[PDB]
Enzyme design. Sequence first.
Site, PDB file in Angstrom:
ATOM      1  N   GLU A  35     -67.383  12.301 -51.255  1.00  0.00           N
ATOM      2  CA  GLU A  35     -66.687  13.444 -51.496  1.00  0.00           C
ATOM      3  C   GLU A  35     -66.305  13.476 -49.927  1.00  0.00           C
ATOM      4  OE1 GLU A  35     -65.293  15.526 -53.002  1.00  0.00           O
ATOM      5  OE2 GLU A  35     -66.179  14.801 -55.294  1.00  0.00           O
ATOM      6  N   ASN A  46     -55.963  21.994 -50.101  1.00  0.00           N
ATOM      7  CA  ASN A  46     -55.056  21.759 -51.392  1.00  0.00           C
ATOM      8  C   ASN A  46     -54.328  22.736 -51.561  1.00  0.00           C
ATOM      9  OD1 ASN A  46     -57.553  20.049 -53.010  1.00  0.00           O
ATOM     10  ND2 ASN A  46     -58.295  22.133 -52.654  1.00  0.00           N
ATOM     11  N   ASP A  49     -52.562  24.001 -55.088  1.00  0.00           N
ATOM     12  CA  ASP A  49     -52.796  25.681 -55.807  1.00  0.00           C
ATOM     13  C   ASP A  49     -54.133  26.962 -54.660  1.00  0.00           C
ATOM     14  OD1 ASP A  49     -55.857  24.393 -55.123  1.00  0.00           O
ATOM     15  OD2 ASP A  49     -57.022  25.652 -57.078  1.00  0.00           O
ATOM     16  N   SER A  51     -56.175  26.221 -52.155  1.00  0.00           N
ATOM     17  CA  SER A  51     -58.027  26.558 -52.317  1.00  0.00           C
ATOM     18  C   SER A  51     -58.456  25.190 -51.462  1.00  0.00           C
ATOM     19  CB  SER A  51     -58.580  25.834 -54.147  1.00  0.00           C
ATOM     20  OG  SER A  51     -58.019  24.625 -54.381  1.00  0.00           O
ATOM     21  N   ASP A  53     -61.680  22.162 -50.710  1.00  0.00           N
ATOM     22  CA  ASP A  53     -63.267  21.553 -50.640  1.00  0.00           C
ATOM     23  C   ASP A  53     -63.753  22.473 -49.218  1.00  0.00           C
ATOM     24  OD1 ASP A  53     -62.050  20.709 -53.298  1.00  0.00           O
ATOM     25  OD2 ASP A  53     -60.793  19.303 -52.835  1.00  0.00           O
ATOM     26  N   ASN A  60     -64.932  23.424 -54.122  1.00  0.00           N
ATOM     27  CA  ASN A  60     -64.070  24.629 -54.320  1.00  0.00           C
ATOM     28  C   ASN A  60     -64.401  25.378 -53.809  1.00  0.00           C
ATOM     29  OD1 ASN A  60     -61.447  25.482 -55.454  1.00  0.00           O
ATOM     30  ND2 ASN A  60     -60.746  23.975 -54.252  1.00  0.00           N
TER      31      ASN A  60
END
Length: 130
Positions: A35, A46, A49, A51, A53, A60
């Site tokens: 990750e 992102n 959408d 969002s 992380d 998220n």
Amino acid sequence: KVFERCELARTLKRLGMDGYAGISLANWMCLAKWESGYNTRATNYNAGDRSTDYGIFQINSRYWCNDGKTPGAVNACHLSCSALLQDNIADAVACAKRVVRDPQGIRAWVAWRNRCQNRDVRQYVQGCGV
């Protein structure tokens, strides 16, 4: 902070992650490695959408923490997303525990499915004294 492998393994063990919800420490290590490369300040936006992380587990914003800028998002871990960018990972760990208490467990993270599921993950904790 960018953790060294064994340093992180012991940090996660002390935080109660070993076998949490049936998930071994090696799995959590494999997840953090893929990750974020063990980087607590890793962030990934992102564009699709809107969002983001956050942190070592790339949790998220749409569902887990609040950053005030993700449309119609929730905050299941009840933390500001900033809490997931601290050198100290206690909050990120509490939130990761919350994530896995959901239907999918460790499968919540697609990268775990991609690079850890049904793989030999022993290597991540070997020699760490955990």
